[PDB]
Structure 1
Amino acid sequence: LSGQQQRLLAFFKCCLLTDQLPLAHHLLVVHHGQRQKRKLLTLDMYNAVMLGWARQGAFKELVYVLFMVKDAGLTPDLLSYAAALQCMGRQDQDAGTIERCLEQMSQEGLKLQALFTAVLLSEEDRATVLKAVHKVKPTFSLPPQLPPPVNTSKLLRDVYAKDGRVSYPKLHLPLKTLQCLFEKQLHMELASRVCVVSVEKPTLPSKEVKHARKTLKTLRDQWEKALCRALRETKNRLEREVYEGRFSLYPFLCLLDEREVVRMLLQVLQALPAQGESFTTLARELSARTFSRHVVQRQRVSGQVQALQNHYRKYLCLLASDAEVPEPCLPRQYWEELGAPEALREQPWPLPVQMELGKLLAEMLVQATQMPCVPVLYHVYSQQIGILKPHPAYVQLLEKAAEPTLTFEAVDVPMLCPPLPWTSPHSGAFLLSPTKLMRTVEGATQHQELLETCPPTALHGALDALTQLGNCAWRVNGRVLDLVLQLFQAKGCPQLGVPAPPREMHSLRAEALYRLSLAQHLRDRVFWLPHNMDFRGRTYPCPPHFNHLGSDVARALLEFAQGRPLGPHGLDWLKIHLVNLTGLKKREPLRKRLAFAEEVMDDILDSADQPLTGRKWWMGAEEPWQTLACCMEVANAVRASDPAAYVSHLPVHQDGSCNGLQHYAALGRDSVGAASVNLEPSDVPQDVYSGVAAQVEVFRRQDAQRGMRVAQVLEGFITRKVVKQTVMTVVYGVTRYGGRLQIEKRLRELSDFPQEFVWEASHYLVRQVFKSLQEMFSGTRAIQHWLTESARLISHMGSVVEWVTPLGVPVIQPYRLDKPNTRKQKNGFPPNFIHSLDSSHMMLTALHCYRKGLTFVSVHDCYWTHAADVSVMNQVCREQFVRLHSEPILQDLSRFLVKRFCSEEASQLKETLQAVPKPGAFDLEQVKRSTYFFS
């Protein structure tokens, strides 16, 4: 529909939420009076007004709205009849009148049960309509609810099998403890903000520091008063707009309390960084915050929070180890079994309306806040986007004040209770604040629409994997946190990665400070990280400030709260993991790595006991913090009389190093590719990156002979690690220069390499690595060319490439040329497709591990799990990979693309799709037999 219509409809719905039925009715009447405005008006808007009048009990007003719809010439739909019935139920209308309305429903050819099923309504509304029917002669005759559907796909068939071989893991914490944790999370959700003491050591305040704190407090109070005044003036103007009939944001402002809006704007000023944040981004954030605090308020007033409490305690019983449930069920399945109490307000406001509201809030903040060196926030264009910059004096005042209180959004902090089961894409993660399956802002609406179009069962398999990831419990390690605290307080170490005290150094310090503060806050408290999916389908943790993927130090800090005994092989797995973290003997086999671990055991023990004053071998290792944490675990295990008896909280990371290349070589079944990426079983693992480096070296020597001097500049500086980063950029990308920037960063890290030609060197490395990868792998070269040419052809048609993963979740590329960008779509599709396959293999592995009872989480390529679980999870990854590639993914992709776009350039696309790469000699089953496929 029209953009104006979208906002008018949003205004009416918001008025229903605010209970401003007269204002909405008045605006509707004004629009009806003008013929052009009446054309803008839609039946759904009238239905919404009727619903609100049917929640008030004013039948006469509802009838007047019906008269207006008749004057417009629209015909009353099922929703209008629904509202009439519910109003009659509320007001105890005479049975004969209800019967007359029912006759009019049959006059429009509409069954009452069918109309109720077709049009969604609040349960109070449904109860009212049902009572109306019960007053009338007709019986309610409610149809029984259908049992929840399950996936028929062969890959997920084993997961959904009804045979009672399932042994789902149960959380160690008792049920009562889980309920208390839920209560803490609930209180946090109601407040919507978390105050955390600053990690940085607080010096005794000086006289000047105290004065700065007083000045800041006075300024904050002055800003609060100004903000309240500005909000009131804007509300009055918007109410006048409501009388005029122009679209107004007055209900949107009304939904959140005036004090809450002011408190939110003030916290936004405190949260905003010294460099500043984009004005458009800030406006979007403000609108999202308002919607969140309003959904929480609406649930509280409705009573949806109490019903949720009860329903959730029942769900908690399944998770709790002490409580026993006779039939094991998947968490979403169990939730659905208890019922569906999800709020109907989970759906958000239209994006243009949200943008308008956010911009209004940002403008109010800028005008209201003034401080003497005038306004705190300065709007300056940059790319070429307006940004809001904090006052320089304000930043200095903040530094001088050194306030220990840090505010964080409820969404920003990890949950204190298990995440809500993902029964639907829209409703997941935080119980009170709805989390949308698509974490990524870009392409979220299109992807969400695709998800709704996709059958629920296919969504269900991914939803189960996400729920399982959320259910995993994370506890911060005390020892690592303490060491990081000591270094962070006093300068820190660049090699360790602790940021130096506060161009980007200040930002890094602030981000680290927030992450450490969250870690300290949750150090003694078990917490659950919800997982959200991007467009590619990769799973990411929802909280931005604290997540394992974000930083190496965070990876060291985070360890499983649930504890599983090492077992006979657990100690060996810990040693192998430690060697992997160091990066020593990567090419050598696992047996050699274990022998090396025995050789370096003395260093391991010394480093664990005294990290700061020890040999500091862990610092030498490529991942210092992770190495130190592993060293501590190994030391504890040896100290314990039995290593098998000892329980290792710390995760053991198993990775294929090049998951995308492994998928490319499996798809083409290339023998050379399988050997290079370790798909083929071998006594000694062969490093793909080393082979790429060799091929790069031969190309480098050819270029040195040639006039181009880039090779000479890079001669002797193409280290294996840098090559590894370049290979990852080529295989995995969103067609962005940022990955190339990472290659540049690796080149910058080498002091000997000149930075004068670093940009050219990064470009040249990308080209050389791409040539090397294609040359070494015939199957990969073919598949990549086919994908690139298919994506390019689809982009020319003008439709964004859309494909369905083997799991069944549809993946779309969110690139929009200001139309799809041909460059991004053609280059993006091979990496995005490879990512989707990797995520599919990860979800299959996770679900099967869940059936086995292993705790599984995925961080990038690495698959995290307990040391005892590692061997089993390796077997699962080897079987699931084979099963995924057993299905003809290339053929399925070609057929799906043919359906999506060929039946519309399409013929050329059809020919390209038809010419799928032929299967290679290498046997798929070999992957199962390959011990070194993941290591």
Structure 2
Amino acid sequence: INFFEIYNSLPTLEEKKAFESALNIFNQDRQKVLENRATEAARERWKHDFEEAKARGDISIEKNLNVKLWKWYNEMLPLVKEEINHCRSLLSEKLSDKKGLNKVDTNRLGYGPYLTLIDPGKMCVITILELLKLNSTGEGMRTARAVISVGKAIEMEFRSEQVLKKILWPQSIRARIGSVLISMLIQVAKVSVQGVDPVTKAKVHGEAPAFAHGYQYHNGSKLGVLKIHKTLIRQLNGERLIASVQPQLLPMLVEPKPWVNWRSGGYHYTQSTLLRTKDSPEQVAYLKAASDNGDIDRVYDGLNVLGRTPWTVNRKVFDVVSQVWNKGEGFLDIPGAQDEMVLPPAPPPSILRAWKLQVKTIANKFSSDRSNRCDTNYKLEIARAFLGEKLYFPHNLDFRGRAYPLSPHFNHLGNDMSRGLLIFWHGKKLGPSGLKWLKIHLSNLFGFDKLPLKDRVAFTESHLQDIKDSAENPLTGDRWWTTADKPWQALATCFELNEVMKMDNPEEFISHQPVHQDGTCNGLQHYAALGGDVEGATQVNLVPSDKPQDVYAHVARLVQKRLEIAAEKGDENAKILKDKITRKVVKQTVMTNVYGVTYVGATFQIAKQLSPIFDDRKESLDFSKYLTKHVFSAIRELFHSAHLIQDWLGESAKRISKSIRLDVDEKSFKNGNKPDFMSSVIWTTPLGLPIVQPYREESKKQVETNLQTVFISDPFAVNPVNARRQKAGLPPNFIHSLDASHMLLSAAECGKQGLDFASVHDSYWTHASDIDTMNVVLREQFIKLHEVDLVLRLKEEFDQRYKNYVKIGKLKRSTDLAQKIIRIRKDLSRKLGRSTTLADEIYFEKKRQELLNSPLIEDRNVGEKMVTTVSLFEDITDLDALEGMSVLLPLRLPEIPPKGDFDVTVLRNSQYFFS
């Protein structure tokens, strides 16, 4: 049955609404079935199999897998009950004095509430699931994650009942609970086995422990493997019934739960976090505080509107891709069917090295083809299963703010074919605006976006017979569609235009294609508004203009001139590359540059986008680096205000990383005068999202567990910050936060208007009918966002938040200005009896502000009479200019670079803002 075809066949809006409601109600149950966790189904199945075996009365080893798992569950439940009883006897005692007991109760409170019955299911299922998951077959996994995976599984299991109504468990507690549960399972994991005694040469019948703990040496390190019995391996290999507890992530069928809190929102029976916080407690704490206060409600609204777009799968494109799929030949995007990895001939030393290179290249090609084919397998099975269904995508933000879909296998964030296999569920009246916009969409899909609007429409009109043929004969025809740059999207839109031309009146047509309104270098368009640079704005198509001035084309022209000069001076590689400078590669590099990309990443990108062009066939790195060395110079020489603003942000990041607290360091941190930096760059977006950079120095520490001491990195413990990473990460983090803010404001305004808005970061998608309204909304939201001085607001918020912070700086002691500080430390030295300590200096400085903290008059007057080492530095206007001996310096943040004179109301009338 085809729900999409039925809904299309219904012409009336009222019956369409009734159909949508009926399908929502009908698919509620299907969604619940799809999201059910296999913690009860596996137990019921095992009990059913055991009952069937008991009733039948005949022993069958092949079917005995579930019966054996039931036996393990029975032998393991009372022992976990005993451990829980030990817990509840231990913690509940009134006296809280430790009497030298040999027990640990940190995990006890962890597994106190419910961890009695559903647990052995998780341990059995996970330990069996990791058959050779960690390349431990030489069977078995690594205990390091085996204990944590059980803890992680319990984590999700505990949240399962909470959502049915201790935010984050430490990795130490996770490992502890996992190890105790696995050891308990190991005790009662018995299985029948037969072996031959060399004394008798006859089969010997008995029992053996199913899972035996052991340690394995690899290059000089104990690994702590957790092996599995060979008979069990044999039995599990045949059945191939994983029955995993946690179902995978698939596109929803019911309208997703709107975001309300930082913790609830999205899937109807699963926990999802508003931030993709990998592992950090500070981000979670600040996000929770922001949620409780209520200062990201507009972010909630933006995510709601971005996620409330219903989709479906494009049947015709699905049929075409399925046909080429079953053909399985070497095709443009899908790799094809490969049989075997051909072995290069093995020589019986230069020849040997050439053979080694060939072997490595062939193995790499094998791995790449296999990975691509497996992905394509999963994507196409999902599409095949989801034909004629409503596909709601609930979205989610990473820590910076950019919105992502929750389902990671089938989404419009994927490649070209994945995007093409998707169309809007809704249909809306196309009209003249829709016709023009959809023709423009195909024109820019073919890569001809750098040309004006009328020229694009003329191009689409011109290749009318080409569209007709490419849609009439998808294969073995002219195959003009493959000549494009976005093949499957081009195929879908061509299909639609061919049908339109076959229709007498284009106005009556009902459209489903998503029309692409993207932007060129959103990062540059945000530097332009931040710095007020008129030259940048007129370079990046921000000011109104008759024709769009493409930034990638401009930088390509500049690098072409540069390499022409290089060819004149005599570089052979420049001479070769004189005529083959590509907008694609220069675009990718320029676009990534604003994202704080590194040199290695950029040269990898140029090599990646140069290899298909085959300027150099295999050694793509050697030419890519040579291109980068000139391309970065060109970009930097063209862009000035952007560079100044990012330099200010990076310098501020450094001066924040090297900071020192006041209250925290008042208590001795046990390192004496040598301090421990513990402050991270933190600010609020215009929307209000607290953006805490997570970079820190994490070092692993062995945690005691019953099985062994697992060597894990505990993020929950306080660690120092990584100054290098934070400085390198501040500018792109800020810019991406601004992009996300613009994205979410635009989405909220579009939802208020009543549109369908699906967006991939900067690029925005809507039906061809409402492109005009979406463009107006885009421009209005951008100007509203950047009508105020965000960089100045950021600097004053840094000053407000980091007011009472003391940097560390090593000025020369011989400087005549040292006299006051020398006197202060000398009196402290007399009181201390030795050299003055930085901890005592911080304590005295805090005492100075402590007196001023109390509004009481005598507290203020004496506080005004107090003299500290820092107060000496408060008199210099330019401390950085003044700046050996280490001494306390107050936190000084440089003033914002000068702002230009730019007008967002002027940019508003630029049709080529987002083409």
- Do they superpose with TM above 0.5? yes
| Corresponding residue of 1:246 | 104
8 Å Cα contact 1:793-1:905 kept in structure 2: no
Asked whether the 8 Å contact 1:730–1:769 carries over to 2, the reply is no
Q: Would you say the 8 A contact 1:747–1:753 is kept in 2?
A: yes
Task: Check the 8 A contact 1:369/1:376 in 2, yes or no.
Answer: no
Deviation at 1:230, TM superposition (A): 8.8
Q: How far 1:619 moved relative to its partner?
A: 1.4
CA distance in 2, matches of 1:891, 1:498: 51
Structure 1 residue 807: Cα displacement: 0.9
Q: Which stretch of structure 1 is more off in the superposition, 541-550 or 287-296?
A: 287-296
Q: Displacement, 1:677?
A: 1.2
Q: In the alignment, residue 812 of structure 1 is paired with which amino acid?
A: V
2:62 aligned with 1:182, yes or no? no
Match of 2:685 among 805, 809, 821: 805
CA deviation digits over 1:829-866, x for unaligned, max 9?
11111111111111110011011101112113211111
Offset of residue 571 of structure 1: 1.6
Could you say if the C-alpha distance between residues 410 and 177 of structure 1 is closer, same or farther in structure 2, counting changes exceeding 3 Å?
same
Match of residue 640 from structure 2: 778
Inter-partner Cα distance in structure 2 for 1:235 and 1:434: 27
Please state whether the residue corresponding to 1:929 is helix, strand or coil: coil
**Deviations along 1:649-704, whole A, 9 cap, x unmatched?**
22111111211111111212222211221101122211111222233344546667
> 1:604 aligns to what?
467
**Aligned ranges for residues 633-672 of structure 1 at < 5 Å?**
633-672=496-535
Residues 608-647 of structure 1: pairs in structure 2 closer than 5 A: 608-647=471-510
Contact 1:565 1:644 in 2 (8 A): yes
CA contact (8 A) 1:730 1:766 kept: no
Give the Cα–Cα distance (whole angstroms) in 1 for the partners of residues 537 and 507 of structure 2: 35
Cα-to-partner distance string for 1:579-638 (whole Å, 9 max, x where unaligned): 21210x222111111110111122222222322222222212111111112212222333
C-alpha change, 1:442 and 1:488, in structure 2 (3 Å) is: farther
In the alignment, which of 490, 514, 520 is matched to residue 378 of structure 2?
A: 514
Question: Equivalents in 1 of 2:111, 2:287: separation in Å?
Answer: 33
Letter in 1 for 2:388: D
Aligned to 1:930: 910
Deviation at 1:471, TM superposition (A): 1.7
Distance across 1 between alignment mates of 2:469 and 2:551: 34
| Matched ranges for 1:344-383 at <5 A | 347-357=167-177
Deviations 1:510-537 (A, max 9, x none): 2222222222222222121110100110
Matches within 5 A, 1:455-854: 456-498=293-335, 500-501=337-338, 503-583=367-447, 585-700=448-563, 718-733=581-596, 741-753=604-616, 755-756=618-619, 758-759=620-621, 761-797=623-659, 798=677, 799-818=679-698, 819-854=720-755
Q: Distance in 2 between matches of 1:366 and 1:764?
A: 58
* CA separation of 1:193 and 1:486: change in aligned 2, threshold 3 A: farther
Q: Deviations over 1:52-96 (max 9, x none)?
A: xxxxxxxxxxxxxxxxxxxxxxxxxxxxxxxxxxxxxxxxxxxxx
The residue correspondences of 1:42-57 to structure 2 (distance < 5 A) are: none
> Does the C-alpha gap of structure 1 residues 507 and 589 become closer, same or farther in structure 2, counting only changes over 3 Å?
same
C-alpha spacing 1:753/1:549, structure 2 compared with 1 (3 Å):
same
Partner of 2:286: 450
Give 1:417 deviation, angstroms: 1.2
Residues 1:922 and 1:911: Cα distance change in structure 2 (over 3 Å): farther
Contact 1:856 1:864 in 2 (8 A): yes
SS of the aligned residue for 1:685 comes to coil
Whether contact under 8 Å (2:132, 2:141) holds in the other structure is no
Partners of 2:429 and 2:134 in 1: CA distance: 45
CA distance in 2, matches of 1:219, 1:623: 53
**1:231-270 CA-partner distances (Å, limit 9, x unpaired):** 6597378558646743346557426253455345555669
**2: distance between equivalents of 1:386 and 1:416?**
44
Distance across 1 between alignment mates of 2:212 and 2:314: 40
Change (3 A) 1:712 1:399: farther
Does the 8 A contact of 2:65 with 2:235 survive in 1? no
Q: Which sits farther off after the overlay, 228-237 or 605-614? A: 228-237
- Aligned: 1:431 with 2:291: no
The whole-number CA distance in structure 2 between the counterparts of 1:852 and 1:479 is 32
Instruction: Return the structure number with greater helix share.
Output: 1
1:435 CA drift (Å): 0.9
The alignment partner of 2:270 has SS state of coil
Cα distance in 1 for residues equivalent to 2:72 and 2:628: 52
**SS across alignment from 1:775:** helix
Report the Cα distance in structure 1 between the residues aligned to 2:572 and 2:72, rounded to whole angstroms. 60
Aligned residues: 698
| More divergent stretch after superposition (694-703 vs 879-888) | 694-703
Kept after mapping to 2: 8 A contact 1:734/1:824: no
Residue 856 of structure 1 corresponds to 757
- The question of whether the paired residues in 2 share the 8 Å contact of 1:412 and 1:545 is answered with yes
SS in 1 for 2:912: helix
Could you report, residue by residue, the CA deviation over 1:349-401 in whole angstroms, capped at 9, with x for unpaired residues?
445423444567788999979999x999998979x99899999x99x999998
Larger Rg: 2
Equivalent-residue separation in structure 2 for 1:675 and 1:461 (angstroms): 31
Contact 2:130/2:141 (CA < 8 Å) preserved in 1? no
Distance 1:518 1:721, change over 3 A: same
How many Å separate the matches in 2 of 1:551 and 1:397? 39
Task: Check whether the contact 1:571–1:643 (CA below 8 A) recurs between aligned residues.
Answer: yes
Gaps of 5+ in 1: 1-169, 196-214, 305-342
What is the alpha-carbon distance in structure 2 between the residues aligned to residue 475 and residue 379 of structure 1? 50
Structure 1 range deviating more: 496-505 or 892-901: 496-505
Counterparts of 2:85 and 2:277, CA distance in 1: 37
Q: Is the 8 A contact 1:419 1:428 kept in 2?
A: yes
- C-alpha change, 1:821 and 1:596, in structure 2 (3 Å) is same
Unaligned runs of 5+ in 2: 1-15, 42-59, 91-102, 195-209, 339-365, 660-676, 699-719, 808-878, 881-888
Does the CA-based 8 Å contact 1:549-1:860 persist in structure 2? no
Secondary structure of the corresponding residue to residue 469 of structure 2: helix
Q: TM-score, normalised by structure 1?
A: 0.66
How far off is 1:562 after superposition? 2.0
Q: Distance in 1 between matches of 2:530 and 2:728?
A: 19
**Cα 1:427/1:297, change in 2 over 3 Å:** closer
User: CA shift at 1:294, angstroms?
Assistant: 4.3
In structure 2, the CA distance between the partners of 1:916 and 1:862, relative to structure 1 (3 Å rule), is: same
Q: Contact between 2:325 and 2:334, CA under 8 Å: does it hold in 1? A: no
1:865 maps to a residue whose letter is T
Are the structure 2 counterparts of residues 232 and 511 from structure 1 closer, same or farther at C-alpha, using a change threshold of 3 Å?
farther
- Aligned counterparts of 2:384 and 2:632: Cα–Cα separation in 1: 44
- Which whole-Å CA distance do the structure 2 matches of 1:224 and 1:737 have between them? 51
What's the Cα RMSD here? 4.5
